[PDB]
Design a protein around this ligand. Structure first.
Ligand SMILES: COc1ccccc1OS(=O)(=O)[C@@H]1C[C@@H]2O[C@H]1C(c1ccc(O)cc1)=C2c1ccc(O)cc1
Ligand SMILES: COc1ccccc1OS(=O)(=O)[C@@H]1C[C@@H]2O[C@H]1C(c1ccc(O)cc1)=C2c1ccc(O)cc1
Lengths: 237, 10, 243, 9
């Protein structure tokens, strides 16, 4: 039996808020306006965030109950989705900008510095705007991020699905606590979960660029980042 | 093997 | 305005009535497979299905309220997801198999006839098995397929008014799913859990479409067999953004 | 576009 299923709704929320990684800073010639400087800052940042993400995942209730192999698979599948939802979340209060770090706020004009990137920047901005207009709460955000981790590679069993149901229970618990009627609760649950399809889409589309040879060649990538990319390229044509 | 394998352990 | 005034039952009846037919392939069990022949069968099938899909989309409540430009965009975005959800639906009661057509029933070993396809076939089989375990109902299926059509391209489009309308229609479809579950005797906790389970499957259908599309618009997959103009244009809507 | 045309019909 997994401890996770025995947690109460409030306990699940507290566990997830406690597990939150910190918001990292970029390196401090700032304002990147070249393919190289942009890739340099973003890959450096992503690499550091990955270490925090791995340690965060271990603290997501139920993740620890998976085999090491299963844990590797979920993280390989979800890592870019998880970076992306984080980015969209912390960009909420900065309409029209993406807050990559407190000291790295980019607009779409900088998205053009790397070929293929501006389309994704635009999707991320749209997603941040959608979160802002839904008034997404931190409690809901951490539930969604945990659902991404558990859901994005589950289709290779019962355990992950029982945990996912518990997170669902936890989201509704949050909405009912916020005073939403039953109709509003199910409408909001659906609204949030449909955004996850968009986050998957953005990851698939960004990943396809990131594991291309051109994108791999811009700057030397860390061994860890290359391994996380290769996990997806494995299946590419 | 994979770095991720190592990082997930301790 | 029609979409917003429909009751749940009227939404369901509208969606069921609008369902496309199940088409046949040109499969000949006396013409053993081959990368070429498999690709030919699937492309020919998909191509004919697209025509019915276009006419189905016109009957999805709220869809014709959109500008022509926006209708094109939604269909360009969602077409493979829509073909795929149809496939996994008709494949439910065929464990271990994909029912591409009543005369074309394939398993994973035949997915190996085309490089890169077996991985997608395994995902489709898993999704079908998921729908089977959940005992997905036809009424639920048509709701999910309409959600894919309205949702998949909504963030990649006055122009804001179109998004808002789409959001309201999506909310009505949610209302409709919940109504069906309540009608089926599910407890409220069961309703929300099942609603969530179905919507999470949409993320997987998105994933499958993106991975499949990436192979389909590769120069290799486009020169296995002559492709129809309509498919070429649907594929190109996605290739345009690829590296 | 053919899709554009078929939708317009
Ligand atoms: C330079 O990246 C791209 C160039 C062209 C197309 C897609 C690209 O990637 S992308 O999906 O926009 C991606 C989304 C955003 O920008 C990229 C990126 C990133 C991530 C990893 C990497 O090794 C290279 C780039 C991001 C990112 C970084 C840190 C976060 O905490 C959150 C997001
Ligand atoms: C031959 O297709 C592929 C080869 C290699 C990798 C992915 C491929 O595509 S795929 O996602 O499996 C795709 C899923 C499944 O098989 C392929 C296919 C298809 C679709 C369009 C096309 O022009 C070529 C192939 C399918 C399909 C066809 C009709 C349906 O009603 C439903 C699904």
């Amino acid at each position: 039996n997994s401890l996770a299923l025995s947690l109460t709704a409030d306990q699940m929320v507290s566990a997830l808020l406690d597990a939150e990684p910190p918001i990292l800073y970029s390196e401090y010639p700032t304002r990147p306006f070249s393919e190289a400087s942009m890739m340099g800052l973003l890959t450096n940042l992503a690499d550091r965030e990955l270490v925090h993400m791995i340690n965060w995942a271990k603290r997501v209730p139920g993740f620890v109950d998976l085999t090491l192999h299963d844990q590797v698979h979920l993280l390989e599948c979800a890592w870019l989705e998880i970076l992306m939802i984080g980015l969209v979340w912390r960009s909420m209060e900065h309409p029209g900008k993406l807050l990559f770090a407190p000291n790295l706020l980019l607009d779409r004009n900088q998205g053009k510095c790397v070929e293929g990137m501006v389309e994704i920047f635009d999707m991320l901005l749209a997603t941040s705007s959608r979160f802002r207009m839904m008034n997404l709460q931190g409690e809901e955000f951490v539930c969604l991020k945990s659902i991404i981790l558990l859901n994005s590679g589950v289709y290779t069993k019962d355990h992950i699905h029982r945990v996912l149901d518990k997170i669902t229970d936890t989201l509704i618990h949050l909405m009912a606590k916020a005073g939403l009627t039953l109709q509003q609760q199910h409408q909001r649950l659906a609204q949030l979960l449909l955004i996850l399809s968009h986050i998957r889409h953005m990851s698939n589309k960004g990943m396809e660029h990131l594991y291309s040879m051109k994108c791999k060649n811009v700057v030397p990538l860390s061994d860890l980042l290359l391994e996380m990319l290769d996990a997806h390229r494995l299946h590419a044509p | 093997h994979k770095i991720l394998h190592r990082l997930l352990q301790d």
